[PDB]
Design an enzyme around this catalytic site. Structure first.
Site, PDB file in Angstrom:
ATOM      1  NE  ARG A  54      -3.345  -2.055   2.033  1.00  0.00           N
ATOM      2  CZ  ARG A  54      -2.456  -3.025   2.158  1.00  0.00           C
ATOM      3  NH1 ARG A  54      -1.207  -2.770   2.488  1.00  0.00           N
ATOM      4  NH2 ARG A  54      -2.858  -4.264   1.947  1.00  0.00           N
ATOM      5  CB  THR A  55       3.156   2.648   2.604  1.00  0.00           C
ATOM      6  OG1 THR A  55       2.284   2.382   3.712  1.00  0.00           O
ATOM      7  CG2 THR A  55       3.780   4.007   2.891  1.00  0.00           C
ATOM      8  CG  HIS A 134       2.399   4.567   8.856  1.00  0.00           C
ATOM      9  ND1 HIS A 134       2.701   5.216   7.684  1.00  0.00           N
ATOM     10  CD2 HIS A 134       1.935   3.350   8.497  1.00  0.00           C
ATOM     11  CE1 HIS A 134       2.433   4.422   6.661  1.00  0.00           C
ATOM     12  NE2 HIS A 134       1.966   3.278   7.126  1.00  0.00           N
TER      13      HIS A 134
HETATM   14  O1  LIG Z   1       1.747  -3.064   9.348  1.00  0.00           O
HETATM   15  C1  LIG Z   1       0.508  -2.856   9.269  1.00  0.00           C
HETATM   16  O2  LIG Z   1      -0.364  -3.723   9.544  1.00  0.00           O
HETATM   17  C2  LIG Z   1       0.033  -1.413   9.191  1.00  0.00           C
HETATM   18  C3  LIG Z   1       0.857  -0.553   8.201  1.00  0.00           C
HETATM   19  N1  LIG Z   1       0.603  -0.981   6.839  1.00  0.00           N
HETATM   20  C4  LIG Z   1       0.558  -0.123   5.800  1.00  0.00           C
HETATM   21  O3  LIG Z   1       1.200   0.959   5.798  1.00  0.00           O
HETATM   22  C5  LIG Z   1       0.133  -0.743   4.470  1.00  0.00           C
HETATM   23  P1  LIG Z   1       1.523  -1.409   3.535  1.00  0.00           P
HETATM   24  O4  LIG Z   1       2.564  -2.090   4.448  1.00  0.00           O
HETATM   25  O5  LIG Z   1       1.195  -2.125   2.289  1.00  0.00           O
HETATM   26  O6  LIG Z   1       2.297  -0.062   3.066  1.00  0.00           O
HETATM   27  C6  LIG Z   1       2.302  -0.420   8.628  1.00  0.00           C
HETATM   28  O7  LIG Z   1       2.566   0.118   9.767  1.00  0.00           O
HETATM   29  O8  LIG Z   1       3.110  -1.089   7.943  1.00  0.00           O
END
Ligand SMILES: O=C(O)C[C@H](NC(=O)CP(=O)(O)O)C(=O)O
Ligand SMILES: O=C(O)C[C@H](NC(=O)CP(=O)(O)O)C(=O)O
Ligand SMILES: O=C(O)C[C@H](NC(=O)CP(=O)(O)O)C(=O)O
Ligand SMILES: [Zn+2]
Ligand SMILES: [Zn+2]
EC number: 2.1.3.2
Lengths: 310, 153, 310, 153, 310
Positions: A54-55, A134
């Site tokens: 996502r990020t 975050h």
């Molecule tokens: O880890 C998670 O569950 C929440 C969070 N997740 C997100 O940011 C989405 P992703 O890892 O795809 O970028 C993070 O802190 O990494």
């Protein structure tokens, strides 16, 4: 210049409601009429020392959706840091000489901080630093909360899951605590509980918050239900009793749900939410996901453009 | 200017005088801010009873001059002690360790996943009046801790 | 057309002072006024079979900084070569049919050579082939040496570190040996010593060079101090006595340093240089790093544009 | 029969008094002996002078007396250091540290592959004088190291 | 009682000529007049914390040859020390409560000694503690030297190979220094020479040793050519330069060698002894391996028996 121009977005503790409010505004603006060329000629580095779907992806689309070009990495394993014993600082030292901004996700805390010490003029954007912050996550969160509630003051907000290690809830609690009359309900395993230092902040602010032992009783009086996966990878072996989700949410649980209430989740989810919810309308985590563009965009826009965006 | 009972030339023309140090605290300080890594004539008095302080540790350096910052730092281990700016044998100024903004280099973040360990940077905590004690917030990880649990280099 | 048009930049042994001089010139030119659209429509492949932070990233920024689009890879592990037992040649065979130029880094020597045998019309740029060459590195080096010294003839140049396995020093010694009155001082572990074939070249050229057992005595009469990390990954187990750096440089060592003298390093550095140096002004390796854009750009520009750049 | 020459003395009524301590070894001692724990007033002369011995560290411990072995390992650290036993404000006893036969529980066998590390036992080296330095043989690995190296633990 | 009854045989440095002579003499007697039941009813422990072919087995055969019963382990991996995490101290402490003596081989130096501090009145026998002492080796060796030469004084003994990590020659050298007029030649690569403290005894005892960069300098000089194996297992990475035999013995280098001369080797051998030597009447390594039976019984007998009469 705009307030956030050439500014490092590292922790939400360093932003003001005005700041927050500004990004939002700009998000809602760009979401209406996009500026496909707003950042052309710019090159941004996407540095992920940590895993992300996502990020990382949402950020890179944002940059392309603004005419910016992107360089960087999804894994440090192939960086000279990765295989030649380089230091993160020197890493940032060279990279600051190439690009206009740095987006980085990292397995340890204050990693983004560190980077600003060597980044130079080049602003640093934290895509997650350990259990710490975050911020960009928070921004899409707020944008979504406001989207669906109409406000960020006077909400009933329930944060379930891993809060000890949830950088996601770390930032966002700090963020609405900058708003007024916000009710915080916390449902967490006693070891994945919320850290003291966030509660104190709440204490001094006089913001109210109350532990809860089940979703069952908060469920009638909540606007927002922020669910979180157990940060399994940051867990200590003495916490591995808590690796399985204590609180799972299914559609059944939402009868009493306020008609306006939405379920939110940083993503990803493993079993803390059951796919039946996906059908129901309180479910908003996939819409929540979609909003990351706008926020990330708005942010990029602000940090890179002196003159307040048209 | 030391008073009665026997002799003690624990008084110099130039230097600084850490009066009233809570017992045992003396030793620590000497290491922590590494006050012995000078070459000037130091003289240290451990556990010497006085009166006001039943037993007070105490340090003095010759020709050495404490910084308003350097001074303040002692407010974590002996905020009730007194610095004396001794010039030409006479007290030019009497100061006290007042609580500082933050304590850069000499304090190790207790957080293991803190980046401050791996990378070469100077430690740093913001200081705070929690309730019955001081709270310490790592510059990096943003985790804050008691000034009793945090350890220092 | 310009001399280096549609030319493969594989080894510095195949370039002339005119060549070198040309890239430089063009580097200094583009550094003054950039040509953001000079290479649009072009697609370049960034193929890294080997680890890199600097080389890969600086090259990709260069391509974007000229309107070019980029495709490629940071790790061969996911290439069909990586998982299907493909041959590098066939690899290059297909890739030559897609893009306009190929940048490749590879764990073995003469790998870029090999590629030109299958690359076809598509020019091949070596980003490092084993212990062998690293031409683009040399170019930024020279650019930097000239930046800070005003010339490339008559310099006192000290090369410390791993020279047996240092592709970096392999190329660059060859490069200033194309210039006149260049004093070469070599400080290296007797096993990581400089290869014969580079010295002979020096002999026949009549260029002077002299081994040294410490930085201490060269230090007063040197314009440039080129430091290098021990190529630990190319080391043979019978050389693992030499894996730790013999010659570390701290600020203390630079009192006698000519006021004009600069410290250079290909990067990365592990302990051969101490961070105190980072403060001092002879330190130029991070500025050295920043220069890679310009050179890589200039090069790209020349190789891809028939008509000498405006 | 009284106090010293230079002008900074505080002779104790009874106790040990270590003098002649080579520079910057006065603080090592203070620690590697745990004489900072006790209550008894302590006097520490850091970077004191000597002219002929240069700078000297001196330790005045009031009413405490050095173990007859504690002086045996001090034989190593400060061989040029002297220890004045003192009773009724006077230098009643006069001793000097000679190099013991073997020393235990304080040094660490520099041989990594020595069992002593892994297993729970007390170190032990034999102290035999070579020419220019004392050599210590670890009682287990039977390797012999020069006191300079075994003095890094 | 005999001088050795109930003694710990840990280091050769703890025994005298007369102690040695005693053993060789018993060795001698037993080799001709066997004592099938000498150690009957005795139960001995064979505790190998490290690999052994010759030492462990020969020991155990010796035991059975004397009617003793054996009990132990060829490996620490399935002991409670190996899996449950028991200290060796506790280990020797309970085993000492079971058996009549303890035969121990251990990878760390001094393991031998520490056992005695826990075995109570139960004698402990060093089958080898790291690269420190191999006392039982020296005994079959002495025995073997004696048998071939008919003396143990005024010998010309060569000691080739890893001498730094060679526990077998550490032990053999202190033993021959107890005799008269022996002459030592040490041929080993610098990284592995005879440890100082050893030579320190030699010098300090008025004995004549000499170092040689080759085997053939002493070949017609020496009576005993003691070859050793490189202890790669104890080697340091920095020392990995030296993992190959630097002095290898061929059956042709023996051409000018004294006819009474015998080639010994504690074993095993990798490539430092050519198989063609095996045939030559100088090759004596396999016979000495045989004498381990006699020296070893011999030993066992003296420790567990107050009065031997043969
Ligand atoms: O880890 C998670 O569950 C929440 C969070 N997740 C997100 O940011 C989405 P992703 O890892 O795809 O970028 C993070 O802190 O990494
Ligand atoms: O390896 C080095 O130390 C020097 C040199 N390094 C560089 O090119 C910088 P990087 O590996 O980030 O591209 C190389 O030969 O790989
Ligand atoms: O290991 C060697 O090369 C010499 C010597 N070898 C022996 O004892 C023979 P083995 O390992 O079969 O018992 C040793 O000290 O272990
Ligand atoms: Zn921290
Ligand atoms: Zn030892």
């Amino acid at each position: 210049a705009n307030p956030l121009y050439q500014k490092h977005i590292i922790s939400i503790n360093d932003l003001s409601r005005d700041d927050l409010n500004l990004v939002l505004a700009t998000a809602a603006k760009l979401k209406a009429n996009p500026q496909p060329e707003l950042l052309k000629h710019k090159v941004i580095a996407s540095c992920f020392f940590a895993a992300s779907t996502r990020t990382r992806l949402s950020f890179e689309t944002s940059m392309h959706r603004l005419g910016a070009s992107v360089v960087g990495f999804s894994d440090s394993a192939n960086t000279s840091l990765g295989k030649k014993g380089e230091t993160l600082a020197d890493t940032i030292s060279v990279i600051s000489t190439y690009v206009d901004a740095i987006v980085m996700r990292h397995p340890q805390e204050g990693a983004a901080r560190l980077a600003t010490e060597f980044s130079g003029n080049v602003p640093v954007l934290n895509a997650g630093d350990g259990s710490n912050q975050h911020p960009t996550q928070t921004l899409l969160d707020l944008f979504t909360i406001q989207e669906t509630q109409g406000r960020l003051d006077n909400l009933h907000v329930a944060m379930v899951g891993d809060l000890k290690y949830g950088r996601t809830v770390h930032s966002l609690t700090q963020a609405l605590a900058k708003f007024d009359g916000n009710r915080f309900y916390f449902i967490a395993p006693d070891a994945l509980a919320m850290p003291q230092y966030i509660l104190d902040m709440l204490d001094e602010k006089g913001i109210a918050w109350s532990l809860h032992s089940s979703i069952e009783e908060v469920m009638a009086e909540v606007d927002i239900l922020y669910m979180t996966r157990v940060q399994k990878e940051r867990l200590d072996p003495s916490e591995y009793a808590n690796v399985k989700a204590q609180f799972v949410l299914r559609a059944s649980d939402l009868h009493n749900a306020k008609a306006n209430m939405k379920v939110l989740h940083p993503l990803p989810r493993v079993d803390e939410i059951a796919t039946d919810v996906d059908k129901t309308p309180h479910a908003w985590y996939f819409q929540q996901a979609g909003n990351g563009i706008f926020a990330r965009q708005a942010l990029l826009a602000l940090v890179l453009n002196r003159d307040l965006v048209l | 200017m030391t008073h009665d009972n026997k002799l003690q030339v624990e008084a110099i023309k130039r230097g600084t005088v850490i009066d009233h140090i809570p017992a045992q605290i003396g030793f620590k300080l000497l290491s922590l801010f590494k006050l012995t890594e000078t070459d000037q004539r130091i003289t240290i008095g451990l556990n010497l009873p006085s009166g006001e302080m039943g037993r007070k540790d105490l340090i003095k350096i010759e020709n050495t001059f404490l910084s308003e910052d350097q001074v303040d730092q002692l407010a974590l281990y002996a905020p009730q002690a007194t610095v004396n700016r001794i010039d030409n044998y006479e007290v030019v100024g009497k100061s006290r360790p007042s609580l500082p903004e933050r304590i850069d280099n000499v304090l190790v973040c207790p957080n293991s996943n803190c980046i401050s360990h791996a990378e070469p940077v100077s430690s740093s905590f913001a200081v705070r009046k929690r309730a019955n004690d001081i709270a310490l917030k790592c510059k990096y990880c943003e985790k804050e801790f008691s000034h009793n649990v945090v350890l220092a280099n």
